[PDB]
């Protein structure tokens, strides 16, 4: 019937794609010259300088980089997860892949799948929709599609709804098992947006038959026209010998002000209340209590200077020197970078962060023009840098969780529209349980 559009889609939102993953995508691009390799990104949550460097390098590698916001694929639902301080990138990619495929067609792939064999110049899908029989379980990390395919469009709408209701997801039945073997985050991702969600949809849609179970698909029993290559053989195209499962702060959170973070939380909660009636106060309070080091790497433009931060000045010429400062009250105190070349160190200085930090700086190819990955690594070091010298330690004075919760409560419940839409508030904080009770009584008398 239809043909899979000649596009290969890869998604990496948040920080820059690791170089290992860039190499895999490059191979897919070289081995499949007839196909346009595209890496999808989100400019709203990405480090701008590093992203610009990446887009240029990808242009040199023959890889198209597209933004989800500019192409109209980021539904407000995906934007709600990406604007979270620690986003579940797995749920985001599981949702963006369906919207991207539905708008451009082509093949979605995970950057960990390697190309062993080039794809056919034309791939035909009797239903405009193909999956791989790899994994047993259902693989959602290889998906082929013709632009606008109805199945993909239905999945895209259904995943949105699943996500909206994610807070009512229970680890029951097949998920009860999986909670204990893989973890909570992982198991919930699979039920809400991943293969679990997908299985139920493909069952509901009749694409999978009576016999298939979530952990025993039985592809050999199914309609083979839904499978790449029209059979249950392992396709030649793919090969595989983690990232999204640990919750990491999205970029620059350490460099936002308390008030800006409060403001972001208030917007997200409003979304939650308006879509679900649920006020997950402690989720927000426990994100917002975390304050890692503020930091800036001095670029051509002059730096906005946060009190209590690190400022790193790159060198003028390649054989110039890096300089680091602890900014205290906009006063700049210069931390002594330990010499790493003369060696001649004492055993004390082996564990020293500053020495290890200097070593990292010395390994920059071009100190005047560092790569995105070099910038990324230095950033990462700065976020966690903790000298033995207490005088050069970032202080990171920050409100505790319960105070933050109190502030979020005041702001949300002072809005009469939101206040009246709240059905259920989650908080374990003793000072806030009676305020939640009071609102419950208020609602009870109307
Ligand atoms: Mg990712």
Curated annotation (Swiss-Prot):
The keyword Chaperone does not apply. Disruption phenotype: Cells lacking this gene grow similarly to wild-type L.pneumophila in both murine bone marrow-derived macrophages and the soil amoeba Dictyostelium discoideum, indicating that SetA is not required for efficient intracellular replication of L.pneumophila in host cells under laboratory growth conditions. Keywords: Glycosyltransferase, Secreted, Transferase, Ubl conjugation, Virulence. Ubiquitinated and polyubiquitinated when ectopically produced in both yeast and mammalian cells; however it is unsure if this modification occurs during the L.pneumophila infection of host cells. It is found in: Secreted. Its EC number is 2.4.1.-. GO terms for cellular component: extracellular region; membrane. One of its GO terms (biological process) is mannosyl-inositol phosphorylceramide biosynthetic process. Induction: Is induced in the post-exponential phase of growth. Residues 1-366 are annotated as: Glucosyltransferase. GO terms for molecular function: mannosyltransferase activity. It comes from the Bacteria. The keyword Metal-binding does not apply. Production of SetA in yeast is extremely toxic, it causes a severe growth defect and alters yeast cell morphology. When expressed in mammalian cells, SetA causes cell retractation. Secreted effector that interferes with vesicular trafficking of host cells. Possesses glucohydrolase and mono-O-glucosyltransferase activity by using UDP-glucose as a sugar donor substrate. Is able to glucosylate histones H4 and H3.1 in vitro, but it is unlikely that histones are the natural substrates for SetA. May glycosylate a component of the host cell vesicle trafficking machinery during L.pneumophila infection. Multidomain protein with an N-terminal glucosyltransferase domain and a C-terminal phosphatidylinositol 3-phosphate-binding domain, which guides the Legionella effector to the surface of the Legionella-containing vacuole. Both domains are essential for the cellular effects on the eukaryotic host. This is Subversion of eukaryotic traffic protein A. It comes from Legionella pneumophila subsp. pneumophila (strain Philadelphia 1 / ATCC 33152 / DSM 7513). The chain holds residues 25 to 475 of 644 of the full protein.
């Amino acid at each position: 019937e239809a043909q899979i559009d000649k596009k290969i889609h890869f998604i990496w939102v948040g920080h820059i794609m690791p170089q290992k993953n860039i190499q895999v995508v490059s191979e897919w691009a070289e081995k499949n010259p007839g196909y346009e390799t595209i890496i999808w990104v989100d400019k709203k949550i990405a480090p701008a300088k590093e992203l610009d460097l990446f887009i240029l390098d990808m242009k040199s590698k023959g890889i198209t980089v597209k933004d989800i916001n500019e192409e109209g694929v980021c539904r407000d639902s995906i934007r709600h997860e990406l604007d979270q301080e620690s986003p579940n990138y797995g749920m985001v990619s599981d949702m963006l892949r369906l919207n991207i495929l539905a708008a451009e067609g082509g093949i979605y792939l995970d950057s960990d799948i390697l190309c062993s064999a080039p794809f056919p110049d034309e791939i035909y899908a009797p239903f405009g929709f193909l999956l791989s029989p790899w994994s047993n379980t259902l693989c959602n990390d290889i998906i082929l599609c013709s632009k606008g395919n109805q199945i993909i469009q239905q999945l895209a709408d259904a995943i949105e709804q699943s996500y909206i209701a994610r807070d009512s997801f229970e680890f029951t039945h097949e998920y009860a098992s999986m909670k204990e073997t893989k973890g909570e985050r992982i198991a919930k991702t699979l039920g809400v947006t991943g293969p679990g969600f997908l299985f139920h949809q493909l069952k509901k849609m009749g694409i999978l038959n009576d016999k298939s179970e979530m952990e025993a698909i039985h592809w050999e029993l199914q309609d083979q026209r839904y499978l790449i290559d029209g059979s249950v053989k392992e396709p030649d195209y793919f090969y595989v010998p983690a990232s999204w499962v640990p919750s990491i702060k999205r970029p620059g959170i350490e460099n936002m002000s308390f008030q800006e973070r409060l403001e972001n939380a208030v917007q997200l909660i409003a979304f939650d209340i308006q879509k679900t009636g649920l006020f997950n106060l402690d989720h927000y309070a426990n994100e917002l209590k975390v304050k890692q080091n503020s930091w800036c790497i001095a670029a051509e433009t002059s730096p906005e200077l946060k009190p209590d931060s690190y400022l790193l000045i790159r060198p003028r010429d390649k054989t110039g020197e890096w300089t680091l400062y602890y900014v205290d009250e906009d006063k700049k105190l210069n931390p002594v970078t330990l010499p790493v070349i003369k060696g001649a160190i004492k055993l004390s200085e082996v564990s020293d962060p500053l020495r290890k930090f200097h070593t990292l700086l010395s390994q920059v190819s071009d100190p005047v023009n560092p790569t995105a990955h070099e910038l990324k690594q230095i950033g990462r070091a700065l976020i966690e840098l903790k000298p033995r010298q207490d005088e050069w330690h970032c202080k990171n004075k920050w409100s505790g969780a319960e105070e933050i919760a109190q502030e979020l409560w005041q702001r949300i419940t002072s809005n009469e529209t939101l206040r009246a839409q709240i059905k259920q508030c989650f908080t374990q904080f003793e000072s806030l349980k009676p305020r939640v009770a009071e609102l419950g009584l208020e609602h009870h008398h109307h």
